[PDB]
Amino acid sequence: DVLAGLSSSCCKWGCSKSEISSLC
Amino acid sequence: RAAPYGVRLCGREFIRAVIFTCGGSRW
Q: Does B24 reach chain A within 8 Å, measured CB to CB?
A: no
Asked if B11 lies within 8 A of A21 by C-beta distance, the reply is: no
Experimental technique of record: NMR
Task: Provide the domain count of chain B.
Answer: 1
What one-character-per-residue DSSP string does B6-25 give? Answer: EE---THHHHHHHHHHHTSS
- For chain A, what percentages of helix, strand and coil (3-state, to nearest 5) are there? 65, 10, 25
Asked if A23 lies within 8 A of B18 by C-beta distance, the reply is: yes
From B8's Cα to the closest Cα of chain A, the distance in A is 4
Counting beta carbons within 10 angstroms of the beta carbon of residue A10, is it exposed (0 to 12), middle (13 to 18) or buried (19 or more)? buried
Q: What is the DSSP letter of A15?
A: E
- Residue A1 host element (H or E): none
| Structural domain for B13, as ranges | 1-27
**Whether B1 contacts A3, CB under 8 Å:** no
**Among B11, B21, B26, beta carbon nearest to A20:** B21
